[PDB]
Amino acid sequence: FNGLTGTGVLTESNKKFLPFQQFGRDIADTTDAVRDPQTLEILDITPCS
Amino acid sequence: DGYFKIYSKHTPINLVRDLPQGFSALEPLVDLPIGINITRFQTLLALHRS
Numbered sequence A: 001f002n003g004l005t006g007t008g009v010l011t012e013s014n015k016k017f018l019p020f021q022q023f024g025r026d027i028a029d030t031t032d033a034v035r036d037p038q039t040l041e042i043l044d045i046t047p048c049s
Numbered sequence B: 001d002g003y004f005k006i007y008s009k010h011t012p013i014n015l016v017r018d019l020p021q022g023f024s025a026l027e028p029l030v031d032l033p034i035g036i037n038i039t040r041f042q043t044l045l046a047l048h049r050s
């Protein structure tokens, strides 16, 4: 996604992304949500179990 | 860092003569490719000359 590279499961989530926000950093400062450049959708990033 | 950033958050101020207590989060509103030298500024208001 837009140069940011990694592995995970892209599952649709209900996170309330404000229009300016793009990333989804967590408590431990871990990427957990990204916005698709083509269509504005909030996708939850989750590593494979 | 060569950027002009403006943040705004419109709030319905209640019956307080001055800036009220509480909190308000100024959301990002626009970002522009700027970098001209900045030292001073001035506001503009409409003078009553109708």
Ligand SMILES: *[C@@H]1O[C@H](CO)[C@@H](O)[C@H](O)[C@H]1NC(C)=O
Residues within 6 Å of the ligand: B037, B038, B039
């Ligand atoms: C902006 O202009 C002032 C006044 O001449 C000058 O002292 C200052 O160095 C300038 N700043 C930059 C970043 O060019």
